[PDB]
Motif scaffolding. Sequence first.
Motif, PDB file in Angstrom:
ATOM      1  N   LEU A 196       7.789  12.578  -6.367  1.00  0.00           N
ATOM      2  CA  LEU A 196       6.963  11.801  -7.285  1.00  0.00           C
ATOM      3  C   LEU A 196       7.491  10.380  -7.396  1.00  0.00           C
ATOM      4  O   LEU A 196       6.712   9.421  -7.461  1.00  0.00           O
ATOM      5  CB  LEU A 196       6.948  12.448  -8.669  1.00  0.00           C
ATOM      6  N   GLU A 197       8.805  10.239  -7.392  1.00  0.00           N
ATOM      7  CA  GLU A 197       9.464   8.946  -7.471  1.00  0.00           C
ATOM      8  C   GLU A 197       9.204   8.144  -6.214  1.00  0.00           C
ATOM      9  O   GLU A 197       9.356   6.920  -6.212  1.00  0.00           O
ATOM     10  CB  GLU A 197      10.940   9.190  -7.651  1.00  0.00           C
ATOM     11  N   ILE A 198       8.842   8.823  -5.127  1.00  0.00           N
ATOM     12  CA  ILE A 198       8.592   8.194  -3.843  1.00  0.00           C
ATOM     13  C   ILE A 198       7.129   8.254  -3.437  1.00  0.00           C
ATOM     14  O   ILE A 198       6.459   7.222  -3.363  1.00  0.00           O
ATOM     15  CB  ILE A 198       9.468   8.852  -2.752  1.00  0.00           C
ATOM     16  N   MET A 199       6.627   9.455  -3.145  1.00  0.00           N
ATOM     17  CA  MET A 199       5.263   9.618  -2.653  1.00  0.00           C
ATOM     18  C   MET A 199       4.206   8.904  -3.466  1.00  0.00           C
ATOM     19  O   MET A 199       3.261   8.336  -2.905  1.00  0.00           O
ATOM     20  CB  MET A 199       4.901  11.093  -2.600  1.00  0.00           C
ATOM     21  N   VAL A 200       4.349   8.912  -4.784  1.00  0.00           N
ATOM     22  CA  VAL A 200       3.375   8.225  -5.608  1.00  0.00           C
ATOM     23  C   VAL A 200       3.495   6.746  -5.320  1.00  0.00           C
ATOM     24  O   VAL A 200       2.492   6.027  -5.283  1.00  0.00           O
ATOM     25  CB  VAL A 200       3.618   8.508  -7.096  1.00  0.00           C
ATOM     26  N   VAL A 201       4.711   6.270  -5.105  1.00  0.00           N
ATOM     27  CA  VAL A 201       4.918   4.853  -4.879  1.00  0.00           C
ATOM     28  C   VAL A 201       4.528   4.413  -3.496  1.00  0.00           C
ATOM     29  O   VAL A 201       4.103   3.265  -3.306  1.00  0.00           O
ATOM     30  CB  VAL A 201       6.375   4.490  -5.141  1.00  0.00           C
ATOM     31  N   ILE A 202       4.689   5.284  -2.509  1.00  0.00           N
ATOM     32  CA  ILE A 202       4.342   4.909  -1.148  1.00  0.00           C
ATOM     33  C   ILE A 202       2.876   4.546  -1.154  1.00  0.00           C
ATOM     34  O   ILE A 202       2.464   3.576  -0.510  1.00  0.00           O
ATOM     35  CB  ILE A 202       4.609   6.051  -0.161  1.00  0.00           C
ATOM     36  N   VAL A 203       2.078   5.292  -1.899  1.00  0.00           N
ATOM     37  CA  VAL A 203       0.664   5.001  -1.965  1.00  0.00           C
ATOM     38  C   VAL A 203       0.490   3.673  -2.670  1.00  0.00           C
ATOM     39  O   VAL A 203      -0.125   2.752  -2.128  1.00  0.00           O
ATOM     40  CB  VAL A 203      -0.085   6.115  -2.698  1.00  0.00           C
ATOM     41  N   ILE A 204       1.081   3.537  -3.855  1.00  0.00           N
ATOM     42  CA  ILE A 204       0.943   2.314  -4.638  1.00  0.00           C
ATOM     43  C   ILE A 204       1.379   1.115  -3.824  1.00  0.00           C
ATOM     44  O   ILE A 204       0.828   0.020  -3.976  1.00  0.00           O
ATOM     45  CB  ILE A 204       1.760   2.391  -5.941  1.00  0.00           C
ATOM     46  N   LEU A 205       2.357   1.298  -2.950  1.00  0.00           N
ATOM     47  CA  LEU A 205       2.805   0.190  -2.129  1.00  0.00           C
ATOM     48  C   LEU A 205       1.659  -0.219  -1.221  1.00  0.00           C
ATOM     49  O   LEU A 205       1.181  -1.356  -1.281  1.00  0.00           O
ATOM     50  CB  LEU A 205       4.027   0.591  -1.317  1.00  0.00           C
ATOM     51  N   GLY A 206       1.215   0.694  -0.367  1.00  0.00           N
ATOM     52  CA  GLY A 206       0.156   0.353   0.558  1.00  0.00           C
ATOM     53  C   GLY A 206      -1.137  -0.017  -0.136  1.00  0.00           C
ATOM     54  O   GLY A 206      -1.837  -0.931   0.301  1.00  0.00           O
ATOM     55  N   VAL A 207      -1.455   0.660  -1.237  1.00  0.00           N
ATOM     56  CA  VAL A 207      -2.681   0.341  -1.956  1.00  0.00           C
ATOM     57  C   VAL A 207      -2.567  -1.078  -2.464  1.00  0.00           C
ATOM     58  O   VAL A 207      -3.555  -1.817  -2.500  1.00  0.00           O
ATOM     59  CB  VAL A 207      -2.934   1.325  -3.111  1.00  0.00           C
ATOM     60  N   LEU A 208      -1.370  -1.496  -2.853  1.00  0.00           N
ATOM     61  CA  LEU A 208      -1.213  -2.849  -3.353  1.00  0.00           C
ATOM     62  C   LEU A 208      -1.253  -3.813  -2.184  1.00  0.00           C
ATOM     63  O   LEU A 208      -2.131  -4.674  -2.109  1.00  0.00           O
ATOM     64  CB  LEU A 208       0.095  -2.988  -4.125  1.00  0.00           C
ATOM     65  N   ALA A 209      -0.317  -3.669  -1.253  1.00  0.00           N
ATOM     66  CA  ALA A 209      -0.226  -4.578  -0.124  1.00  0.00           C
ATOM     67  C   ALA A 209      -1.494  -4.638   0.705  1.00  0.00           C
ATOM     68  O   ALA A 209      -1.724  -5.637   1.388  1.00  0.00           O
ATOM     69  CB  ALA A 209       0.942  -4.167   0.761  1.00  0.00           C
ATOM     70  N   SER A 210      -2.329  -3.609   0.665  1.00  0.00           N
ATOM     71  CA  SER A 210      -3.539  -3.639   1.476  1.00  0.00           C
ATOM     72  C   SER A 210      -4.609  -4.587   0.978  1.00  0.00           C
ATOM     73  O   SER A 210      -5.179  -5.354   1.762  1.00  0.00           O
ATOM     74  CB  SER A 210      -4.143  -2.253   1.564  1.00  0.00           C
ATOM     75  N   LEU A 211      -4.909  -4.541  -0.316  1.00  0.00           N
ATOM     76  CA  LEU A 211      -5.965  -5.363  -0.890  1.00  0.00           C
ATOM     77  C   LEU A 211      -5.452  -6.625  -1.555  1.00  0.00           C
ATOM     78  O   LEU A 211      -5.957  -7.027  -2.609  1.00  0.00           O
ATOM     79  CB  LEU A 211      -6.785  -4.552  -1.881  1.00  0.00           C
TER      80      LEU A 211
END
Lengths: 67, 67
Positions: free
Chosen positions: B4-19
């Motif tokens: 949760l400390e990682i996987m949730v963030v991996i998404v938030i990372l790409g979701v952020l950096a993508s748009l």
Amino acid sequence: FTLLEIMVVIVILGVLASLVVPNLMGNKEKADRQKVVSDLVALEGALDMYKLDNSRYPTTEQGLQAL
Amino acid sequence: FTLLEIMVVIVILGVLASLVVPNLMGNKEKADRQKVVSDLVALEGALDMYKLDNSRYPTTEQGLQAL
């Protein structure tokens, strides 16, 4: 948005502000001369008119206000 | 803590950096034009001043440094 939005502009700022040199200072001082030189002929020429009607010029204390 | 400390963030990372698309590259090149076009009037207009006092313009080898 933070770097491209800024860093690219920081350059554009200095690149712009650097090679924008409009002019000098003191040109008005040169203008002060002709402004007074213009008076010279205008002063004496105007006094000559009074030197015609009254056949003479006004007194110092009488000043140019007499004109 | 590991997922949760990682996987949730991996998404938030790409979701952020993508748009997050700030802008283009090359806008400064367009600015280079007006920077030089600004000089054009500033150059000739400034030379005209020298064309007034000395009644003429400087020589090639004399360059703009004469201004």
